[PDB]
Design a protein around this ligand. Structure first.
Ligand SMILES: O=C(CCCCC(=O)Nc1c(I)cc(I)c(C(=O)O)c1I)Nc1c(I)cc(I)c(C(=O)O)c1I
Ligand SMILES: CCCCCCCCCCCCCC(=O)O
Ligand SMILES: CCCCCCCCCCCCCC(=O)O
Ligand SMILES: CCCCCCCCCCCCCC(=O)O
Ligand SMILES: CCCCCCCCCCCCCC(=O)O
Ligand SMILES: CCCCCCCCCCCCCC(=O)O
Ligand SMILES: CCCCCCCCCCCCCC(=O)O
Length: 582
């Protein structure tokens, strides 16, 4: 109403408010100590309560941006600590807020956050749930100044849940560690995605983004009328543009407003937005974004009717090209929740090319008449890969499957770094263990989601330390040919194998006293180095060498005087092995 702070305070709640303000400040003032942010939070909360009691108390009428910047400019060491940022305080609103946005460092030089021992965690937890959680929430926020605050808050509650449950467990570690690893991985993925999507809106442009959304929104809301989907795609695009700019307030309101729009028109959009829409303000958006696909009508026509077998098609298309293509995507995507969004884009892209080089032809109706015939090989390629790879995954285990990938990609790009190969092959290996368990009708969307993260993660490391044109090609290609481009890569014939190095293939008993997740990376590192030394090896020659190594390990660990054993059988191993691989 007349007071913004009061309003947000009222419908967010004290607890949520206090946490958000914390994250908000930790994101702009990434260098101040924890205890300092706590003071600000208390001061702002105290102020808020004043306004709650009387929307007319001093300053309660000022806008959040104004209020936020004023307290921000309140910090004394602003200039001595942040320098340039202090000059923002000289500017007025909105240049002031704009100025603060431009000075937020997305990759501060903060030390890697370390995970202490479960016992200390659980103890610190029990002795002060409050500071324990706010302190960590502070550490995460200052490191990811662009992570959508509410989402960060969503994660905090799951961490709390993990401590509550596990710190009472008979075996704390076995209960907590896995939940924690799962949590940071998921958090990492959530972050990689947010950055990825913004980057995209930048490179590829708005049209491609609008396309992506139509495909996605249509799979999810197959019953919605096309005009509703267009309406939603427009608002969604404005929403991400603003949320990418990094301004929390504008971002949050666009998201809420959009959630309220959806919920009000719920029936004419989806039947599965029931739970999500009764939920509280804070969670609505989160919920909705994650909602399961509604069910598609059974009384659905044939695409060929309006898109192939109907003359007056080049006329509808010329009438409004993007809109017609949109209707195509809409019609195609809502009938295929099983297709990957990018697959859908490929088809539409194909259709588009056809209509372009066929509507300017003699007899249109038959120039393009067999278009749906070109979609089949587009659809099949992805499917057969999910087919071939999920089987191999079930045969071997997650680990042996990972090793397979390891050999496979080293031979494609032997120039890539050994640790980078190990990283990629394992996450990749994960996508397999995480998606292959799904029923085929859900597999492809699964892989797309995971692979996009992995492929962009792959492309960044390379962007910085480029090592191959082939990779750089796939990495700067269209995000529709990205994965196909990588899938295409062939063995590197040009490659000149690295020289030999005894050390690289020398092992000590220490590997016996390492975690399964440790020995692995050690064995896997040697594997790449192996393939990098003998690239013309065979899955047969290789499997034989890997096998002798298998024994070698167990044999030397489960044998008296480990150290010597290794150095003894090791000389033998390296010797017999170098021989087979001539
Ligand atoms: O990341 C995603 C996940 C899409 C999930 C589909 C989606 O948009 N859901 C959704 C909905 I309904 C409503 C709201 I309110 C919100 C939100 O919280 O803002 C969201 I998140 N989508 C995506 C998009 I949209 C465009 C491009 I270009 C790319 C690329 O980088 O290829 C990608 I990977
Ligand atoms: C979200 C805010 C709560 C974080 C509290 C969890 C403590 C463990 C985080 C350390 C990060 C890690 O797993 O390496
Ligand atoms: C002075 C700064 C105060 C910070 C207030 C942030 C308000 C966030 C509103 C949260 C809306 C949740 C809607 C959603 O995105 O799902
Ligand atoms: C209703 C909003 C208009 C939707 C835009 C339709 C254009 C379809 C483009 C086909 C996909 C190719 C995307 C790309 O440029 O990479
Ligand atoms: C390794 C896990 C199997 C991945 C198979 C590739 C499927 C890619 C689908 C994404 C796309 O349509 O490009
Ligand atoms: C660096 C190593 C390259 C790994 C990229 C593989 C991308 C996944 C596509 C699956 C495939 O067809 O192999
Ligand atoms: C040319 C000397 C090569 C000898 C070094 C062999 C190292 C290969 C690592 C084998 C990893 C297989 C993993 C496993 O056994 O579970």
């Amino acid at each position: 109403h007349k007071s913004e702070v009061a309003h947000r305070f009222k419908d967010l709640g004290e607890e949520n408010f206090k946490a958000l303000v914390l994250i908000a400040f930790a994101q702009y003032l990434q260098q101040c100590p924890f205890e300092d942010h706590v003071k600000l939070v208390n001061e702002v909360t105290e102020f808020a309560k004043t306004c709650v009691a009387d929307e007319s108390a001093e300053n309660c009428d000022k806008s959040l941006h104004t209020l936020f910047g004023d307290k921000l400019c309140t910090v004394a060491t602003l200039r001595e600590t942040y320098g340039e940022m202090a000059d923002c305080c000289a500017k007025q609103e909105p240049e002031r807020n704009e100025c603060f946005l431009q000075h937020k460092d997305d990759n501060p030089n903060l030390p890697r956050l370390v995970r202490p021992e479960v016992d200390v965690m659980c103890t610190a937890f029990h002795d002060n749930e409050e500071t324990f959680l706010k302190k960590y929430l502070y550490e995460i926020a200052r490191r990811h100044p662009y992570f959508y605050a509410p989402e960060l808050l969503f994660f905090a509650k799951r961490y709390k849940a993990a401590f509550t449950e596990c710190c009472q467990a008979a075996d704390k570690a076995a209960c907590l560690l896995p939940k924690l690893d799962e949590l940071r991985d998921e958090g990492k993925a959530s972050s990689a995605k947010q950055r990825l999507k913004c980057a995209s809106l930048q490179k590829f442009g708005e049209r491609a983004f609008k396309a992506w959304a139509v495909a996605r929104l249509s799979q999810r809301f197959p019953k919605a009328e096309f005009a509703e989907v267009s309406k939603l795609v427009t608002d969604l695009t404005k929403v991400h543009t603003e949320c990418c700019h990094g301004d929390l307030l504008e971002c949050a309101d666009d998201r809420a407003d959009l959630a309220k729009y959806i919920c009000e028109n719920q029936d004419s959009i989806s039947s599965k937005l029931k739970e999500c829409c009764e939920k509280p303000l804070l969670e609505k958006s989160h919920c909705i974004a994650e909602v399961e696909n509604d069910e598609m009508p059974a009384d659905l026509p044939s695409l060929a009717a309006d898109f192939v077998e109907s003359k007056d098609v080049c006329k509808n298309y010329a009438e409004a090209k993007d809109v017609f293509l949109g209707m195509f995507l809409y019609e195609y995507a809502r009938r295929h929740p099983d297709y990957s969004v990018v697959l859908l884009l490929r088809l539409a892209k194909t259709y588009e090319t056809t209509l372009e080089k066929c509507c300017a032809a003699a007899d249109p109706h038959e120039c393009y008449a067999k278009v749906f015939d070109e979609f089949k090989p587009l659809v099949e390629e992805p499917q057969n890969l999910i087919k071939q790879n999920c089987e191999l995954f079930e045969q071997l285990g997650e680990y042996k499957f990972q090793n397979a990938l390891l050999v496979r990609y080293t031979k494609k790009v032997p120039q890539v770094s050994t640790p980078t190969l190990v990283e990629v092959s394992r996450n990749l290996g994960k996508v397999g263990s995480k998606c292959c368990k799904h029923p085929e009708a859900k597999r492809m969307p699964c892989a797309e989601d995971y692979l996009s993260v992995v492929l962009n993660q792959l492309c960044v490391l390379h962007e910085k330390t480029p090592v191959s044109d082939r990779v750089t090609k796939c990495c700067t290609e269209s995000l529709v040919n990205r994965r196909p481009c990588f899938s295409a890569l062939e063995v590197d014939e040009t490659y000149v194998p690295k020289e030999f190095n005894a050390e690289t293939f020398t092992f000590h008993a220490d590997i016996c006293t390492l975690s399964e997740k440790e020995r692995q990376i050690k064995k896997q590192t040697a594997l790449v180095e192996l393939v990098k030394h003998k690239p013309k090896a065979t899955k047969e020659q290789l499997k034989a060498v890997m096998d002798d190594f298998a024994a070698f390990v167990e044999k030397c660990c489960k044998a008296d005087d480990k150290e010597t054993c290794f150095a003894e059988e090791g000389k033998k191993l390296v010797a017999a092995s170098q021989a087979a691989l001539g």
